[PDB]
Structure 1
Amino acid sequence: MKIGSGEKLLFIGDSITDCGRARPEGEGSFGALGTGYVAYVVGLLQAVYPELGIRVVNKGISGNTVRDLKARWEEDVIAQKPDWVSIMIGINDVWRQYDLPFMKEKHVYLDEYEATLRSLVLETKPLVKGIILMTPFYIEGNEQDPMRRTMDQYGRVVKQIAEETNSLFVDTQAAFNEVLKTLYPAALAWDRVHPSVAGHMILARAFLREIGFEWVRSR
């Protein structure tokens, strides 16, 4: 388990992270963590590592792109003095390109995305114990669907950033891909973005695996 006793783990991202979390504080009461993968992660950590005494904060905001994250980074991340920061961003940066293809100011293209995300990591890295970069995802098994194809390009950039910055790394797309060998997307998410409890468990598990969670500790 990478996360140590007494440390503060902060999650940030878009609606997939937000899931109705309490604003502004996003802390403690799970009511306050929202009803998706962040809350599930905290639950499982408490169920299996109750003694670790990890504090968790949810700074997800529905609708955000990486440009939105940069705009609130000082208040929502730096000022919180986390020990660990998890970032999952990109879904909207890409989705807007396809659902509002003519409101271009809503779009964040790949070059801007990469540099902005790198800038967040590099600002934050000296201040924390570690960073976990989760790729964005699209719940769609056809690699050639235009939105899946674009999402994968953003995900590959995330992976590159994580390698270069020695951040931990969660390929959320690869985790969905496995399940999409059996299920059609709609079984997980009508809209291919916002999933059922099962999708949130896919995410929570993928995150927990990357931080060295054991389902039954040998320890």
Structure 2
Amino acid sequence: MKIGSGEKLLFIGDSITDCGRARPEGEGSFGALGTGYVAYVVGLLQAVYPELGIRVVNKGISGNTVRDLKARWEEDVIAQKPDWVSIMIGINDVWRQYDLPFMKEKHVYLDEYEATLRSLVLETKPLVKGIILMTPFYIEGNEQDPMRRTMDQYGRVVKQIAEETNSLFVDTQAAFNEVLKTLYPAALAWDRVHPSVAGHMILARAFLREIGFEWVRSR
């Protein structure tokens, strides 16, 4: 378990991270974390590692791109003095290109995305114990569907950044891809983005595996 006793873990991202969390503070055991993967992660950490006393904060905001993250980074991340920061962003940066193809100011293209994401990591890194970069995803098994193919470009950039900055790394697309050998997307998400509890459990599990959670502790 990478995360130590008494440390503060902060999640940031878009609607997938937000999932109705309390604004602004995003912190608490009784519903403030929202109803998705972040809450599940916290639940599993308290169920299996209750004695760690890890404080968890949810700073997800629905609709955000990486441009949006940068605009609130000082208040929502730096000022919280976290020990660990998890980032999942990119879905909207890409989705806008495809759902509102002529509203170009809503789009964040790959080279802006890469430099902005890198800027967040590099600002943050000297201030925390660690960073977890989670790729964006698209719940679509055809690698050549245009949005899937784009998403994969963004996920490859995240991986490159994590390698270069010695951050932890969660490939969410790879997690979905395993399940998509069996299920058509619509069984997880009608819209291919916002999933069922199952999808959120896919995400929470992928995150926990990368931080060295054990389902039943050797300890």
Q: Answer whether contact 1:27 1:33 (CA < 8 A) is retained.
A: yes
Shift of 1:216: 0.1
Q: 1 CA distance for matches of 2:68 and 2:136?
A: 15
Deviations 1:132-154 (A, max 9, x none): 00000000000000000000000
Q: Greater CA deviation, 22-31 or 150-159?
A: 22-31
Deviations 1:139-191 (A, max 9, x none): 00000000000000000000000000000000000000000000000000000
Q: Answer whether contact 1:95 1:147 (CA < 8 A) is retained.
A: yes
- Report % sequence identity: 100
DSSP-derived class of the 2:32 partner: helix
Q: Answer whether contact 1:143 1:149 (CA < 8 A) is retained.
A: yes
Shift of 1:28: 1.1
The corresponding residue for 2:202 is 202
Q: 2 CA distance for matches of 1:82 and 1:99?
A: 35
Q: 2 CA distance for matches of 1:54 and 1:13?
A: 20
What does 1:35-184 align with in structure 2 at a 5 Å threshold?
Answer: 35-184=35-184
Q: 2 CA distance for matches of 1:10 and 1:81?
A: 9
Q: 1 CA distance for matches of 2:30 and 2:113?
A: 31
DSSP-derived class of the 2:31 partner: helix
Deviations 1:90-122 (A, max 9, x none): 000000000000000000000000000000000
Q: Answer whether contact 1:30 1:39 (CA < 8 A) is retained.
A: no
Q: 2 CA distance for matches of 1:117 and 1:30?
A: 32
Q: 2 CA distance for matches of 1:44 and 1:94?
A: 31
Shift of 1:29: 3.0
Q: 2 CA distance for matches of 1:215 and 1:123?
A: 33
Q: 2 CA distance for matches of 1:31 and 1:43?
A: 11
Structure 2, unaligned runs of 5 or more: none
Shift of 1:30: 4.0
Q: 1 CA distance for matches of 2:185 and 2:88?
A: 20
Shift of 1:43: 0.1
Q: 2 CA distance for matches of 1:181 and 1:140?
A: 10
Superposition RMSD on alpha carbons, in Å?
A: 0.4
Q: 1 CA distance for matches of 2:29 and 2:178?
A: 33
Q: 1 CA distance for matches of 2:150 and 2:88?
A: 16
TM-score by length of 2: 1.00
Deviations 1:25-50 (A, max 9, x none): 00013410000000000000000000
Q: 2 CA distance for matches of 1:27 and 1:41?
A: 13
* Number of positions where the alignment pairs a residue of Structure 1 with one of Structure 2: 219
Q: After TM superposition, what 4+ stretches of structure 1 lie above 2 angstroms from structure 2? A: none
DSSP-derived class of the 1:169 partner: strand
DSSP-derived class of the 2:86 partner: strand
DSSP-derived class of the 2:26 partner: coil
Q: 1 CA distance for matches of 2:150 and 2:16?
A: 18
Deviations 1:42-70 (A, max 9, x none): 00000000000000000000000000000
Structure 1, unaligned runs of 5 or more: none
Q: Answer whether contact 1:136 1:155 (CA < 8 A) is retained.
A: yes
